[PDB]
Amino acid sequence: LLVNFNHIHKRIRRVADKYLSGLVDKFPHLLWSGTVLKTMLDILQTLSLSLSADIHKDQPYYDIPDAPYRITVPDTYEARESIVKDFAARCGMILQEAMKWAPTVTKSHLQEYLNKHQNWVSGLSQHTGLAMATESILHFAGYNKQNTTLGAKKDYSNFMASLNLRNRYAGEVYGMIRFDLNKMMVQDLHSALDRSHPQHYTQAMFKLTAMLISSKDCDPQLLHHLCWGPLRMFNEHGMETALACWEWLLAGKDGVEVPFMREMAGAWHMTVEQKFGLFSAEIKEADPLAASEASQPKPCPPEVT
Amino acid sequence: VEGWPEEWYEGVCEIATKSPLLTFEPLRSVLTPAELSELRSTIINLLDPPPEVSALINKLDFAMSTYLLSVYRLEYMRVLRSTDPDRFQVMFCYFEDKAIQKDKMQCVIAVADKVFDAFLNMMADKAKTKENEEELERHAQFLLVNFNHIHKRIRRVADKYLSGLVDKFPHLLWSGTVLKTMLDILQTLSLSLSADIHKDQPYYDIPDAPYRITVPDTYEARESIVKDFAARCGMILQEAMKWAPTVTKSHLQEYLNKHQNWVSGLSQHTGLAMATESILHFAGYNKQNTTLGAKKDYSNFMASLNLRNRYAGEVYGMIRFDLNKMMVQDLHSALDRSHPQHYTQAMFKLTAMLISSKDCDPQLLHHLCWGPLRMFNEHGMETALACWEWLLAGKDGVEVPFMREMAGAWHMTVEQKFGLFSAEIKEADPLAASEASQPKPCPPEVTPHYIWIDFLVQRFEIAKYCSSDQVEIFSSLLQRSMSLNIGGAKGSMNRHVAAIGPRFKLLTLGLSLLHADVVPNATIRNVLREKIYSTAFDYFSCPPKFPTQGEKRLREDISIMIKFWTAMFSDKKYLTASRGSQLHKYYMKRRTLLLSLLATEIERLITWYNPLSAPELELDQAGENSVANWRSKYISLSEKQWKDNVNLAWSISPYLAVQLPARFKNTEAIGNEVTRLVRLDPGAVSDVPEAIKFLVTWHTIDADAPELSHVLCWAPTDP
């Protein structure tokens, strides 16, 4: 329906628009899908490239990458400008609609889309798709944890931090294949955990997940060590690193949700059983009426970050 | 007071240089109306303060007056004859004295303003070396860190000093250290916003700079001060991005690639948010959408950032397991196989390896600069420009060797005639082209020379103020690329129509360099101007023709020509080139002729652009109005003062005189004068397609005077 939205006729595009509106109305979950956005960005880039392509020259047909289809364009410049300007609004509308409800998943998908080698060469040119992606992120953003509940600010550092970490560690782990190797990563992670060093812990975790995301097999031992990592360094920093790694793993590879969910559930049940957090024991304190001894009363509150 | 042996005054200078501060318990406890009146008059004349300060002074006795005079003299002598790098910042030591504050003050800030003005006047013309830039950077950093003082007047006077300093030295805006310091202090304040006010120790330490910051007690004051500070950052950021977006954008990209901030990026980290928010609403248009008549571009930023991080990580991986040989071999293999992806990967890997090292490694730099010359195109040139920008932004103290290598590569390209400096190719005339060699256009193509000149212009704009040696490099590069040999087929540059963009762009860059008032000598400018005029005149020695490129790549050519004409018209800086009148008129005549020719050519090109009126299409109005006014002014010339123009053109070059009537002038005197001149000396011209008709018909039908006719040597012409 998206590829049929730009037909050369008059009523065809109207009926296609009506069908698309109805379909997206009755099935809201299609907004945050991971394939619609890439296709629409690709077709928008194709139209933008076709905007100025020597109208007198023949062959107005074009081929959509990664999808078998074709697009025809009118002859006059005015009609082409009108149709591209008309199409340039639905993209923003559906982007803001998607970002309104579930910002996290669509933000992760947008981050993933901006990490392809083919578009980097042409990024020095217009490449309207990347400009749209990097422009639509800001004015639909929201408040962070610190400034979410106040009575009368905007946050974008997480986006750049995640993107930079992802690209840096992807390159660092891709380098290693030039010169098995899982044993070294496991040993480094164990050494970092034993020495209790946060920087080495984060580096090892990111390197391990970046190695895992680029492979052809599940390698269950790597996933098991990934899920059992933070439980030996219970805190907020390690938990933040683990959440970032889990989000990257979910966004990158496909057909992996079920084993990851099962491993996470097992880790949660183990944490419940060992009473490492909120499920810990209760500690009593001396009452002040008869606390004349050297054991002076003092608060003993559990901490669950 | 100056004015008695000279050594008596001379000795006071070093004593004041080594004297301690006149610091200090009540101030009054420690310490003839005509003399009081005259002392007050002298002090008020020396200071010249606002009237309130004068009224405050009017009620003071003699002791305070002489104390003020003594401290003023001591500080003035100290600042005039000091050598320590902390010259002007010692004055704040007087602002922190509790005894001075408790006394029943504005005189101190007045004398501080006076001494600051004296210091600024001194520094305005000190030198143009790196040390002065470092001192200015340190002073700006000190003024920035003193902007958030706990007192009231201290921050006001600091703000005034900062405003004055940034006003008189605009180049500090795009520096690479001020932005990092201001982001760090902003992050420190944001972190200190909520830090358990009841808990003690309100002090904080600025990273990478030895200083400390104190904060108020109430939350409201802290919020007010942080909100107040949050505006100067945006103001100066937009001011910097307005003028030179490239350098500040590269610095911002470099700042966002540190490992320490990435861990805390999951938190607020206000500095990164400010950096990523201030980039957008001050951005501009790209090359494609820079000249249109009634879009925004950010893909370059993300592409550069992603490539930089990816290749930095990939090259950092290799150190875990010499190595330059492998990189050189890979680059050579990629060049030999002619693969673009491998070429880009090798180039980025090489520059990323080079940026993280401890030695120059001249072979790596030499291979870096000679890379693109073996793959002359636009894609490789774009990759090379990106790599050069990253190298310049990353490492420090490398500008001079890189500039020298780039100049050498440019001269090699000029010598080998690989681009705009290539040879000229002729084509068969259609009148006698019945053979199998049918006529067809053969225009030279110069894509990357159109971008290299832009890069050079950007670098020159950046380096006009700071450095003083790169100007010599640019002067040598411009001097070695031009020659004064206007004539038949020796001008070192192509004369085709499709190659007028880079030519006039380089001419405009040369004129801008001349107007910058950097060369102190009075003879370099003369030679440079002579060469500029020669290479400008050389283009009009060929028969006119029409452009072959499409509708695009034509508007900006007209814009460049209009800009060059405007620059040429504003060249009235003569009478100081040292018999000056001879050279003055010698330049004036050629300037007028060049202006007329440029106006005619621009009119012809704009007429060819769109046949109809086309009110939708439009260009700069001021240039068109000026061209129309000049055409109206020059169209009213009489029969005189125009034959002299023909004589001057003949004195310049016979080819220009022969081609002059081709540029149509609605007057018959031009033809008669050209015929007379060519009859006086026919041997000076041997171009047959146009010059034969000025000699063959001694008389149309009169059939007289059979002498001096030697046509047995002219080249063949059309049947």
CSV table of N, CA, C and O in Angstrom, one decimal, chain A residues 186-227:
chain,number,residue,atom,x,y,z
A,186,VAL,N,35.5,-14.5,27.5
A,186,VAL,CA,35.0,-15.0,28.8
A,186,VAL,C,36.0,-14.8,29.9
A,186,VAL,O,35.7,-14.3,31.0
A,187,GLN,N,37.3,-15.0,29.6
A,187,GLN,CA,38.3,-14.8,30.6
A,187,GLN,C,38.4,-13.3,31.0
A,187,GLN,O,38.6,-13.0,32.2
A,188,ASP,N,38.4,-12.4,30.0
A,188,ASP,CA,38.4,-11.0,30.3
A,188,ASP,C,37.2,-10.6,31.2
A,188,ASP,O,37.4,-9.8,32.2
A,189,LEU,N,36.0,-11.1,30.9
A,189,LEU,CA,34.9,-10.7,31.7
A,189,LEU,C,35.0,-11.2,33.1
A,189,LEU,O,34.7,-10.5,34.1
A,190,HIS,N,35.5,-12.5,33.3
A,190,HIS,CA,35.7,-13.0,34.6
A,190,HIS,C,36.8,-12.3,35.4
A,190,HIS,O,36.6,-12.0,36.6
A,191,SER,N,37.9,-11.9,34.7
A,191,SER,CA,38.9,-11.1,35.4
A,191,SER,C,38.4,-9.7,35.8
A,191,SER,O,38.7,-9.3,36.9
A,192,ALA,N,37.6,-9.1,35.0
A,192,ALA,CA,37.0,-7.8,35.3
A,192,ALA,C,36.1,-7.9,36.5
A,192,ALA,O,36.1,-7.1,37.4
A,193,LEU,N,35.2,-9.0,36.5
A,193,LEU,CA,34.3,-9.2,37.6
A,193,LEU,C,35.1,-9.4,38.9
A,193,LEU,O,34.7,-8.9,40.0
A,194,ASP,N,36.1,-10.2,38.9
A,194,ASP,CA,36.9,-10.5,40.1
A,194,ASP,C,37.7,-9.3,40.6
A,194,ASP,O,37.7,-9.1,41.8
A,195,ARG,N,38.2,-8.5,39.7
A,195,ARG,CA,39.0,-7.3,40.1
A,195,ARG,C,38.0,-6.2,40.4
A,195,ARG,O,38.5,-5.2,41.1
A,196,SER,N,36.7,-6.2,40.1
A,196,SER,CA,35.7,-5.2,40.3
A,196,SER,C,36.2,-3.9,39.8
A,196,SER,O,36.4,-2.9,40.5
A,197,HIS,N,36.3,-3.8,38.5
A,197,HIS,CA,36.7,-2.6,37.8
A,197,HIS,C,35.5,-2.2,36.8
A,197,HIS,O,35.2,-3.0,35.9
A,198,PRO,N,34.9,-1.0,37.0
A,198,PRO,CA,33.7,-0.7,36.2
A,198,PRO,C,34.1,-0.5,34.7
A,198,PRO,O,33.3,-0.9,33.8
A,199,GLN,N,35.1,0.2,34.4
A,199,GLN,CA,35.5,0.5,33.0
A,199,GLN,C,35.7,-0.8,32.2
A,199,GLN,O,35.2,-1.0,31.1
A,200,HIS,N,36.5,-1.7,32.8
A,200,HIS,CA,36.8,-2.9,32.1
A,200,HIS,C,35.6,-3.8,32.0
A,200,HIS,O,35.4,-4.5,31.0
A,201,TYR,N,34.7,-3.7,33.0
A,201,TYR,CA,33.4,-4.4,33.0
A,201,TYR,C,32.6,-4.0,31.8
A,201,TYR,O,32.1,-4.8,31.0
A,202,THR,N,32.4,-2.7,31.6
A,202,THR,CA,31.7,-2.1,30.5
A,202,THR,C,32.3,-2.5,29.2
A,202,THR,O,31.6,-2.9,28.2
A,203,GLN,N,33.6,-2.3,29.1
A,203,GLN,CA,34.3,-2.7,27.8
A,203,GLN,C,34.1,-4.1,27.4
A,203,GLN,O,33.8,-4.4,26.3
A,204,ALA,N,34.3,-5.0,28.4
A,204,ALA,CA,34.1,-6.4,28.1
A,204,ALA,C,32.6,-6.8,27.8
A,204,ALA,O,32.4,-7.5,26.8
A,205,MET,N,31.7,-6.2,28.4
A,205,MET,CA,30.3,-6.4,28.1
A,205,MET,C,29.9,-6.0,26.7
A,205,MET,O,29.3,-6.7,26.0
A,206,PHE,N,30.3,-4.7,26.4
A,206,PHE,CA,30.0,-4.2,25.0
A,206,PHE,C,30.8,-5.1,24.0
A,206,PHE,O,30.2,-5.4,22.9
A,207,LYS,N,32.0,-5.4,24.2
A,207,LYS,CA,32.7,-6.3,23.2
A,207,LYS,C,32.1,-7.6,23.0
A,207,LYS,O,31.9,-8.1,21.9
A,208,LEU,N,31.6,-8.2,24.1
A,208,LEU,CA,31.0,-9.5,24.1
A,208,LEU,C,29.7,-9.4,23.3
A,208,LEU,O,29.4,-10.3,22.4
A,209,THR,N,28.8,-8.4,23.6
A,209,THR,CA,27.6,-8.3,22.9
A,209,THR,C,27.8,-8.0,21.4
A,209,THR,O,27.0,-8.4,20.5
A,210,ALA,N,28.8,-7.2,21.1
A,210,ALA,CA,29.1,-6.8,19.7
A,210,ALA,C,29.6,-8.0,18.9
A,210,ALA,O,29.3,-8.2,17.7
A,211,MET,N,30.4,-8.9,19.6
A,211,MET,CA,30.8,-10.1,18.9
A,211,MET,C,29.6,-11.0,18.7
A,211,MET,O,29.5,-11.7,17.6
A,212,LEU,N,28.7,-11.1,19.7
A,212,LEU,CA,27.6,-12.0,19.5
A,212,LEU,C,26.6,-11.5,18.4
A,212,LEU,O,26.1,-12.4,17.7
A,213,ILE,N,26.4,-10.2,18.3
A,213,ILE,CA,25.5,-9.7,17.3
A,213,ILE,C,25.9,-10.0,15.9
A,213,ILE,O,25.0,-10.1,15.0
A,214,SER,N,27.2,-10.2,15.6
A,214,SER,CA,27.7,-10.5,14.3
A,214,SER,C,28.2,-11.9,14.3
A,214,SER,O,29.4,-12.2,14.5
A,215,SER,N,27.3,-12.9,14.0
A,215,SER,CA,27.6,-14.3,14.0
A,215,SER,C,26.5,-15.0,13.3
A,215,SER,O,25.6,-14.4,12.8
A,216,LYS,N,26.7,-16.3,13.2
A,216,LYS,CA,25.7,-17.2,12.5
A,216,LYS,C,25.1,-18.2,13.4
A,216,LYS,O,24.2,-19.0,13.0
A,217,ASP,N,25.5,-18.3,14.7
A,217,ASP,CA,24.9,-19.3,15.6
A,217,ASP,C,24.6,-18.6,17.0
A,217,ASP,O,25.1,-17.5,17.3
A,218,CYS,N,23.7,-19.2,17.7
A,218,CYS,CA,23.2,-18.7,19.0
A,218,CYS,C,24.4,-18.6,20.0
A,218,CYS,O,24.5,-17.6,20.7
A,219,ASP,N,25.2,-19.7,20.0
A,219,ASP,CA,26.3,-19.8,21.0
A,219,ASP,C,25.7,-19.6,22.4
A,219,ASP,O,25.9,-18.6,23.1
A,220,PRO,N,25.0,-20.6,22.9
A,220,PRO,CA,24.2,-20.4,24.2
A,220,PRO,C,25.1,-20.1,25.4
A,220,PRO,O,24.6,-19.4,26.3
A,221,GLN,N,26.4,-20.5,25.4
A,221,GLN,CA,27.2,-20.1,26.5
A,221,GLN,C,27.5,-18.6,26.6
A,221,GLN,O,27.5,-18.0,27.7
A,222,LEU,N,27.6,-18.0,25.5
A,222,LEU,CA,27.8,-16.5,25.5
A,222,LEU,C,26.6,-15.8,26.0
A,222,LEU,O,26.7,-14.9,26.8
A,223,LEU,N,25.4,-16.2,25.6
A,223,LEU,CA,24.1,-15.6,26.1
A,223,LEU,C,24.0,-15.9,27.6
A,223,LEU,O,23.6,-15.0,28.3
A,224,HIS,N,24.3,-17.1,28.0
A,224,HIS,CA,24.2,-17.4,29.4
A,224,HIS,C,25.1,-16.5,30.3
A,224,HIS,O,24.7,-16.0,31.3
A,225,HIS,N,26.3,-16.4,29.8
A,225,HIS,CA,27.3,-15.5,30.5
A,225,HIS,C,26.8,-14.0,30.4
A,225,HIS,O,27.1,-13.2,31.4
A,226,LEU,N,26.2,-13.6,29.3
A,226,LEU,CA,25.6,-12.3,29.2
A,226,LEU,C,24.5,-12.0,30.2
A,226,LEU,O,24.5,-10.9,30.8
A,227,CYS,N,23.7,-13.0,30.4
A,227,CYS,CA,22.5,-12.8,31.4
A,227,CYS,C,23.0,-12.8,32.8
A,227,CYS,O,22.4,-12.2,33.7
